[PDB]
Amino acid sequence: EIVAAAYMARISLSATGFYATPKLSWDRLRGQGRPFLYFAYGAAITEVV
Amino acid sequence: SVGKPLPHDSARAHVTGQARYLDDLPCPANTLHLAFGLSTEASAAITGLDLEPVRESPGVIAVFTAADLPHDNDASPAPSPEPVLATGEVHFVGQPIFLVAATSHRAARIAARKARITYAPRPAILTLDQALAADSRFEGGPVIWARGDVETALAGAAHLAEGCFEIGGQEHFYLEGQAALALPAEGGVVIHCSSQHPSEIQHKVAHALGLAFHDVRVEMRRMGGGFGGKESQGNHLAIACAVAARATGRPCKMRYDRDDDMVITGKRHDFRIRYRIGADASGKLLGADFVHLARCGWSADLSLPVCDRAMLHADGSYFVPALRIESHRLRTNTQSNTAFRGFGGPQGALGMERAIEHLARGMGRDPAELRALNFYDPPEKKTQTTHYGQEVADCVLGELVTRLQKSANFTTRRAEIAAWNSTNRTLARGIALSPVKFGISFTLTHLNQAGALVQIYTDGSVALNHGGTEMGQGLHAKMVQVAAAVLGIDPVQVRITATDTSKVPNTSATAASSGADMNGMAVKDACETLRGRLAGFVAAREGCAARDVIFDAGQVQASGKSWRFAEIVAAAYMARISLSATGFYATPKLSWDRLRGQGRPFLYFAYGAAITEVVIDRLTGENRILRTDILHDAGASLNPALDIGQIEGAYVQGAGWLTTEELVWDHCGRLMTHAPSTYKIPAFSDRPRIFNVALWDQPNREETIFRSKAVGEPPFLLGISAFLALHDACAACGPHWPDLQAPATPEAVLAAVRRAEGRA
Amino acid sequence: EMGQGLHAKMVQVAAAVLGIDPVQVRITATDTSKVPNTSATAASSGADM
Amino acid sequence: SVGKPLPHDSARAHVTGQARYLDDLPCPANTLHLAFGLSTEASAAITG
Amino acid sequence: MEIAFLLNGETRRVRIEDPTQSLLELLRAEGLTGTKEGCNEGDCGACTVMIRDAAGSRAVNACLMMLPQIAGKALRTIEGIAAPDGRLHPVQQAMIDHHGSQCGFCTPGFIVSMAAAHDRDRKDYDDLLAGNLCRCTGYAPILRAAEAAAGEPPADWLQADAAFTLPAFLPETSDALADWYLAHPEATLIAGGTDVSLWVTKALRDLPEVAFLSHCKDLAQIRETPDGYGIGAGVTIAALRAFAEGPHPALAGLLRRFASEQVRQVATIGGNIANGSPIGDGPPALIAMGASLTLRRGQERRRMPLEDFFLEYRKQDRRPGEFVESVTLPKSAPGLRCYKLSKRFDQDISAVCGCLNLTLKGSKIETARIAFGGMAGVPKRAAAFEAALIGQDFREDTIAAALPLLAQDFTPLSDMRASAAYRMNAAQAMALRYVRELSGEAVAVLEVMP
Amino acid sequence: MEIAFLLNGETRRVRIEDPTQSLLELLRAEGLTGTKEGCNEGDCGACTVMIRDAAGSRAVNACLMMLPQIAGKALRTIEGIAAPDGRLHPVQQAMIDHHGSQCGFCTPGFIVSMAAAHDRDRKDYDDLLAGNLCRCTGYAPILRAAEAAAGEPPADWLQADAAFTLPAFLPETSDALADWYLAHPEATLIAGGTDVSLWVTKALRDLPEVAFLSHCKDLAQIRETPDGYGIGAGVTIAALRAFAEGPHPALAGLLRRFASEQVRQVATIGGNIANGSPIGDGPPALIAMGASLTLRRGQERRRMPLEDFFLEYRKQDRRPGEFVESVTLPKSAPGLRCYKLSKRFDQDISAVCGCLNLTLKGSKIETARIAFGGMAGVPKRAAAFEAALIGQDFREDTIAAALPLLAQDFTPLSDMRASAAYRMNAAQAMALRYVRELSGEAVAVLEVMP
Ligand SMILES: Cc1cc2nc3c(=O)[nH]c(=O)nc-3n(C[C@H](O)[C@H](O)[C@H](O)COP(=O)(O)OP(=O)(O)OC[C@H]3O[C@@H](n4cnc5c(N)ncnc54)[C@H](O)[C@@H]3O)c2cc1C
Ligand SMILES: Cc1cc2nc3c(=O)[nH]c(=O)nc-3n(C[C@H](O)[C@H](O)[C@H](O)COP(=O)(O)OP(=O)(O)OC[C@H]3O[C@@H](n4cnc5c(N)ncnc54)[C@H](O)[C@@H]3O)c2cc1C
Ligand SMILES: Nc1nc2c(c(=O)[nH]1)N[C@H]1C(S)=C(S)[C@@H](COP(=O)(O)O)O[C@H]1N2
Ligand SMILES: Nc1nc2c(c(=O)[nH]1)N[C@H]1C(S)=C(S)[C@@H](COP(=O)(O)O)O[C@H]1N2
Ligand SMILES: O=c1nc2[nH][nH]cc-2c(=O)[nH]1
Ligand SMILES: O=c1nc2[nH][nH]cc-2c(=O)[nH]1
Ligand code: FES
Numbered sequence A: 001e002i003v004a005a006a007y008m009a010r011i012s013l014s015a016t017g018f019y020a021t022p023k024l025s026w027d028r029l030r031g032q033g034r035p036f037l038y039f040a041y042g043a044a045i046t047e048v049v
Numbered sequence B: 001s002v003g004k005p006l007p008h009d010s011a012r013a014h015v016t017g018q019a020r021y022l023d024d025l026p027c028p029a030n031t032l033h034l035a036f037g038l039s040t041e042a043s044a045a046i047t048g049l050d051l052e053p054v055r056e057s058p059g060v061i062a063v064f065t066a067a068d069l070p071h072d073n074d075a076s077p078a079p080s081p082e083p084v085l086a087t088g089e090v091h092f093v094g095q096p097i098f099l100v101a102a103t104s105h106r107a108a109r110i111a112a113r114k115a116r117i118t119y120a121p122r123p124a125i126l127t128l129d130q131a132l133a134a135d136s137r138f139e140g141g142p143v144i145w146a147r148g149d150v151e152t153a154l155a156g157a158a159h160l161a162e163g164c165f166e167i168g169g170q171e172h173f174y175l176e177g178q179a180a181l182a183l184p185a186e187g188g189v190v191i192h193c194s195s196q197h198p199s200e201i202q203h204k205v206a207h208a209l210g211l212a213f214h215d216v217r218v219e220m221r222r223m224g225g226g227f228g229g230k231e232s233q234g235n236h237l238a239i240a241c242a243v244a245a246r247a248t249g250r251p252c253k254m255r256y257d258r259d260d261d262m263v264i265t266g267k268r269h270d271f272r273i274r275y276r277i278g279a280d281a282s283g284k285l286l287g288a289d290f291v292h293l294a295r296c297g298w299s300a301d302l303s304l305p306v307c308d309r310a311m312l313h314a315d316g317s318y319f320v321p322a323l324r325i326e327s328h329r330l331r332t333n334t335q336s337n338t339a340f341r342g343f344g345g346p347q348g349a350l351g352m353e354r355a356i357e358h359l360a361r362g363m364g365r366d367p368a369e370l371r372a373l374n375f376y377d378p379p380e381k382k383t384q385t386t387h388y389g390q391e392v393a394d395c396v397l398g399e400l401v402t403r404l405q406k407s408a409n410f411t412t413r414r415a416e417i418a419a420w421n422s423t424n425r426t427l428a429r430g431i432a433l434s435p436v437k438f439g440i441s442f443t444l445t446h447l448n449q450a451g452a453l454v455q456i457y458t459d460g461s462v463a464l465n466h467g468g469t470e471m472g473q474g475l476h477a478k479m480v481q482v483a484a485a486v487l488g489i490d491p492v493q494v495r496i497t498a499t500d501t502s503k504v505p506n507t508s509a510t511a512a513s514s515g516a517d518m519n520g521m522a523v524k525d526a527c528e529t530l531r532g533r534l535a536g537f538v539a540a541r542e543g544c545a546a547r548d549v550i551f552d553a554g555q556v557q558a559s560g561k562s563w564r565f566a567e568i569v570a571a572a573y574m575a576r577i578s579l580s581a582t583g584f585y586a587t588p589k590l591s592w593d594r595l596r597g598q599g600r601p602f603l604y605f606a607y608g609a610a611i612t613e614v615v616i617d618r619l620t621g622e623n624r625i626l627r628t629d630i631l632h633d634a635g636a637s638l639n640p641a642l643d644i645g646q647i648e649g650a651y652v653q654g655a656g657w658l659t660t661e662e663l664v665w666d667h668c669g670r671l672m673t674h675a676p677s678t679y680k681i682p683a684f685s686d687r688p689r690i691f692n693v694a695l696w697d698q699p700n701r702e703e704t705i706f707r708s709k710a711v712g713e714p715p716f717l718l719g720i721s722a723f724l725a726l727h728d729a730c731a732a733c734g735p736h737w738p739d740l741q742a743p744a745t746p747e748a749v750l751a752a753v754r755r756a757e758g759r760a
Numbered sequence C: 001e002m003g004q005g006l007h008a009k010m011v012q013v014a015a016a017v018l019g020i021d022p023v024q025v026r027i028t029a030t031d032t033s034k035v036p037n038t039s040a041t042a043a044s045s046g047a048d049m
Numbered sequence D: 001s002v003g004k005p006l007p008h009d010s011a012r013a014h015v016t017g018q019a020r021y022l023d024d025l026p027c028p029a030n031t032l033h034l035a036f037g038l039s040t041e042a043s044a045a046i047t048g
Numbered sequence E, F: 001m002e003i004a005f006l007l008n009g010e011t012r013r014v015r016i017e018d019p020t021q022s023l024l025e026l027l028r029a030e031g032l033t034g035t036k037e038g039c040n041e042g043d044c045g046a047c048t049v050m051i052r053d054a055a056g057s058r059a060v061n062a063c064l065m066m067l068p069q070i071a072g073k074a075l076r077t078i079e080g081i082a083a084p085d086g087r088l089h090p091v092q093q094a095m096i097d098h099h100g101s102q103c104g105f106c107t108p109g110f111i112v113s114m115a116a117a118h119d120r121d122r123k124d125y126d127d128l129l130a131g132n133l134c135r136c137t138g139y140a141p142i143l144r145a146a147e148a149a150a151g152e153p154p155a156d157w158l159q160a161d162a163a164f165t166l167p168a169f170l171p172e173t174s175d176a177l178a179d180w181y182l183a184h185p186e187a188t189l190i191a192g193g194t195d196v197s198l199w200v201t202k203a204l205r206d207l208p209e210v211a212f213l214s215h216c217k218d219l220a221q222i223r224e225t226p227d228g229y230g231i232g233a234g235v236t237i238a239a240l241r242a243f244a245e246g247p248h249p250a251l252a253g254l255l256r257r258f259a260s261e262q263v264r265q266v267a268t269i270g271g272n273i274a275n276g277s278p279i280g281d282g283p284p285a286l287i288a289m290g291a292s293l294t295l296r297r298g299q300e301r302r303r304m305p306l307e308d309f310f311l312e313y314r315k316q317d318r319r320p321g322e323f324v325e326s327v328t329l330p331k332s333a334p335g336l337r338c339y340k341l342s343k344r345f346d347q348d349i350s351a352v353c354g355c356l357n358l359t360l361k362g363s364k365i366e367t368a369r370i371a372f373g374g375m376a377g378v379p380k381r382a383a384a385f386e387a388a389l390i391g392q393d394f395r396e397d398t399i400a401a402a403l404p405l406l407a408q409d410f411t412p413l414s415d416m417r418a419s420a421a422y423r424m425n426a427a428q429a430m431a432l433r434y435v436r437e438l439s440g441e442a443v444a445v446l447e448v449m450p
């Protein structure tokens, strides 16, 4: 009911969206910078024969 | 770019036959084809329906009936239903009763004719009077609007004219026929059709299949002509196609053979118009009282808005202190009428037009001054209003007609004609001038919105997409042009894409000559956002202010440096600046009340004028247009070529409507004229031998896309001039009122001649 | 989508932010005429972004 | 909704063979089909 | 059965298994999607394609023409109007530069008609395009295109087709025909096929036992005779028009408005006659100028006056196995004049067709041949009027005074085309025309220049 | 030639013009696009479909199966696993509930396998599924789904198929066979066709003169004999496996890793043998257990001990028109032990397959049959090693000391699967394993539980 009402009020129901990760800067040749936003972690213990 | 006379966006493609329309699209080998089997009665209960011969016909695969419909069964563009397949009873000859999917168009057609159907007939209503008699109507009673008090006005009037006359319908005859295709696509469907209204096709198919809207996607890239014929009757095809598809598991396409198309779809509302008009001694109108009987057909379709527009145009081009309209929308057992270029407008206008002419003959006055004397006042205390109460603040009619009369050598010609007539006894030429004032915007207000979505790729090229549909009227080019103008690049970089409810949603039908006015804004709106992003980026980069970044001719300039648009985009890309945007627009200032007949239902009016000259043959009524001259106002045209073209074509169509175009039904309701061999649109040689068309070039007062003005319907009303002239010729043949009815076929003309001649 | 669940997660975010049940949101095919200039889906960054 | 353990978006369709992948899409009868012919040499000049 | 023809420059051989298929359908089913279908009934032109052979090249409607008919001809559709290297034909650029299109759908049609016109340097546009309806543009911009492109060298690539070729029965000789028809009286003879195809496309009929006559050179001849001209049944209405331009302008003037050039190019006088319709436009005129008709059965050969061929609506003096072989026209008939009245001038069916021929003994009416189409189940002379006319003086008033007779000669129908009152009134009106015309008065609306 | 089968419940009759085409293709060209193609080579399972006839129901690879093979059978593909009213099969819901699909592509195949297992209440999933590879999920979720569905009553709608049926040659009896082959010695016999289809799919080869053996009930029997068991050539590896589970657990054990259940259900022992590969897994074991093989030509019948059937790589003791009819196994052989060694345990080709059978005179070695696949152009016993082994005591050190004799018995090759030195060393290792095993020590990695 809200949506229909907006349509009749003539409100656009369409939109695009965009995003760019922040904080990144680093230099390949020198090997220096922040090339990553954050780090994923974990651990695993395997047993075999 | 806006402003230059560039060609249609698919010119070359049209001209080498690569442009594809619906039936040209490639489709899987298993695609089925469909055809409706139609009722042969105007009004009856269906009593038996044996389809066995159908299933048994070659190549047939599924057969359908209202009962097989899995959900809704309703294609109407309005709150009251219209079944797609007959539910127990039929209401006009043509009404589809069941549906056949076989492995080929012919096949389906052939099968559609083998049903064994029994009907229990009922008295049928086929004529306005019958309707009237039986109170067979829509909207529980007529609609009445009144400004001032007419009967008073007319009782005390120095001059007067009462008259009644018929205005016949008109079949669109779009060269590409109704058509559609549906492809099951995991869970949902995708419909391709030839429609002016994909967002509705979506809605109706969705409901037909029980699916939320998001599971249905209508794509429509081009129609071969629509003229309103496709504002709604695209629904039945799409529904059947989607429904057959859901059942058989496979793609199903449907296209009407011409004969079916003319029998099933609607046409322009034929009208009976009854008028009394009156004036002053100096000629100023005192009041005009009008009754409109309109033939709507067996279901509502768009009768409601249509008849509202004709009322809304019953003032024609003149200011009238008092004016009344009583509008009946009569229901009858025949094709459900619908939109057609003009959407009521012509009917209402021709109404006032016929009268004012009758008035003029009445007082031995020259029609032209009579009109010219009553046009609304030019612009620039208390501005006049229309009878619905909307200020008319932009009527340039006085100026324009003047200009036209001069440029057309009006006066002199008029004399040359009188002379010529007096020397002839078998032929008479006649000439007339008629004006046009048309309001712009849907009268159903919330339809006036549009959306666009625009993308700029890293190589700088662009893909434009908007809600409109191209039916031959140049919409896409205008939208390309606006886009290239706002982003500052050459049109060549802008590509148009097909209309697709999955790209711009919730669109209105492309109609009411509102295609360009609104989409134009929307695109401009997107392009403005995009340009905005580019300037912001350039500015920060080159330290300085966005508003001094300049985009023109494919080049961007800032702080003395300059670069190619591409180079800017790539860089914004590298900089991570979104290059995509939507855009949307809603026409401002509108408000009005249908029941009261008061408000501002329109943003601005479109005008123009036309002077046509014709000759008729006093013995048989044969006749034809020798010359026409038009001067029409398209605002600051977005594309003069494109506009001249709509003007020329509309004129022809308009005239076509009042001359050889004639619909005929038989005593049992059957459409007798259902094929080009018997319904006759203007053929090449009916083109006027001298056809001068030119534009009034003046900005629009109101804030529209580059101060242009809608130009798709208005010009259609210039056709009246032809009828008017046809009637001038009759008038020249005797001293009585010719009382020429429309359409003016030769039989019709010959009848007018005799009246005026007094030979019966 | 290549099996990793991206479209569900995207439907989920959408339904959450809009305040409605996920059933009301349907995903469409990736299409460059609809969202442009994209990076490949990779770097385990499909959903983050 | 974020946070709940919901199934993949196309799980019903995976599981009944309705999800179409590229070779499952229907296409016009006249569609052509391709294949590369390959080098049989680790490194060479093509002479003929 | 196998036939061959050139298709847009390429040689093509085809296995006909259904001889009744229209050219329009082969085409789209081959994916030559460029030729549109707009009515499938002959009137719109949207299916126009260009054929060629020894007689030259013409544009005709693909929707009326069935396969067997194009054997050994060269065919060119819209997709092959442009040159192999991609260059547009002068006619396309023209249409582009002049905005000759809006919706697009009627275009391939015009281009093909325009091209074929261009190929033969014909410039009578109004008549050449009569058969291409466009609902979008008003036509004006199309005339500019045609004009603009006429100042341009013909397309070479299109003339190269000239060099070419150098189930259902296809006689090559009138003899072969007569033999076979004789054995298969019940067969369906197809000439131009412009009336027969609507039986398959609209009435959804199916015809077995079929023979095509457009391959009998000897049935389609124009022979000068001691006492008139011998016209073969297979002669095309366009052709008949061309020939008449000389000795029978009136007849020529009539045919101008007999369908469109696209139908005239293949429609046959035999056919127009054999069809037997009271609205045929051939018969009235021919009867007015009192031509004769020749039937044929095996080697036998009757020969009546035309009007006598028509007994009742839908029924003719034709014997089992008997077929129309020619008609004969006098060397001259200055008295002829023909009137065609319809809702619209070009490409339209007659409400009434008036054909008048009067001989004079100076001021006195010697002979009166008066025929009408569309006022009865059959075309027929108007005896009582004719009669009452002999011997009287040739002035308006005499005629004025005989009119009523017409209402006894005929008692016309009413229908979508026109009401009986009007058809009647109009028949009468034609005769006033005839006097006024012969007396040199201005009478015809189509001759008025702006 | 026309055959008939039930397709997802519906009866279907097909005209075979190419008998070599695969079920996977008919299937797709019919548009039953749910059966995927992922290797076309038998290894992936992605094309798995379910067939059923009177022996019961089984899941098999449609990419290996040609059409004439399903005649009279009942075919169920993924698109027919759910009931007609739309209900999903217990297995489907399970898959949805437990996230057993990510990319989706290997799913219809797992469903088909899973369903077919459910049909027969089979629960050995690691084996049932070895032949369905999935690259996305780790298998774990699928075992959960399998497990959760087993607690659910079988689908009634799939069982109803049991009611069914109640150019290229198709023999119904060994006689008809022997006759026909005799006249067409050069014909291509196809049994299971799990080796022959790769000639058509990968070598792109084309076979004319073809006969299918899977319809000779009499060629696929297991008969109890006075002195052993007589196994028909058409008996499937699955079938053989099942029979041996009792009297020949070691052979059974081996067959558990012979291809996958999907292949095992149609691959035949006859074929394994007739293919003649030195890596076939059958022969070494049978040789070790000392089985004999019967050939047959017309009515004639030879009969050597199996090892003798293999002469040279790619070359067998087979006469024109002679075919393999059965093999015969002793009633028992407790000493057999079979080792398969590959890169991966399941569905893999052997780098070396070693089979050993020793008989004992208390602590003393009476007989020693020792055979190997993969270490030579042909499966062969290890004579020098066998010989040096008799009379000695069965302890690890005597075996240790005879090892080098294997280097004389075989000179293994090198290839992608393994280097020569490894193949060799492995052979030797197998011997040591055999003592260790029989001597009661723990030695197989596949029997250690976490
Ligand atoms: C678009 C359109 C516009 C038209 N305009 C006109 C018009 O204005 N005026 C008019 O009169 N007609 C008009 N027609 C119809 C007209 O009669 C035919 O198009 C034409 O004259 C018949 O020529 P045809 O060879 O095609 O006849 P066909 O279609 O070949 O059919 C002739 C009929 O007569 C039979 N027939 C043909 N040849 C012989 C033979 N020689 N001997 C015995 N029987 C034979 C055929 O069996 C068939 O029964 C129009 C039709 C269409 C398609
Ligand atoms: C995915 C996959 C995995 C495999 N894994 C293994 C593996 O684990 N170990 C292994 O040993 N093999 C394996 N194989 C193949 C093994 O030979 C076959 O898979 C099977 O044993 C051959 O059986 P068949 O009935 O299909 O023979 P077919 O393919 O039908 O043909 C075998 C050859 O024998 C001929 N032939 C068949 N029957 C007779 C008859 N009785 N008399 C004479 N000639 C006949 C045929 O002409 C053909 O030449 C694998 C194959 C595949 C596809
Ligand atoms: N060539 C062509 N022009 C046309 C039509 C058409 O179908 N073909 N439809 C008309 C109708 S009904 C309207 S309402 C306007 C639409 O123009 P617009 O999109 O810019 O509003 O097109 C008019 N011009
Ligand atoms: N089931 C499945 N999971 C997968 C893959 C795949 O093809 N299928 N691609 C891997 C790779 S390379 C990436 S880079 C991530 C993508 O995660 P994301 O898209 O959400 O960034 O898929 C990982 N997980
Ligand atoms: O007001 C309208 N004017 C229209 N013109 N063409 C279609 C129209 C419509 O729905 N409404
Ligand atoms: O850094 C990257 N990591 C990736 N993973 N998968 C694709 C990747 C890429 O382009 N870049
Ligand atoms: S389709 Fe209209 S003339 Fe052929």
Ligand code: FES
Binding pocket: B175, B224, B225, B472, E100, E101, E102, E103, E104, E105, E106, E107, E133, E134, E135, E136, E137
């Ligand atoms: S452009 Fe539309 S009919 Fe010609």
Ligand code: FES
Binding pocket: F036, F037, F038, F039, F040, F041, F042, F043, F044, F045, F046, F047, F048, F061, F062, F063, F064
């Ligand atoms: S497709 Fe891989 S096993 Fe058949």
Ligand code: FES
Binding pocket: C003, F100, F101, F102, F103, F104, F105, F106, F107, F133, F134, F135, F136, F137
């Ligand atoms: S789900 Fe992707 S391969 Fe198994």
Ligand SMILES: [Ca+2]
Binding pocket: B171, B172, B173, B229, B261, B262, B265, B266, B267
């Ligand atoms: Ca219509």
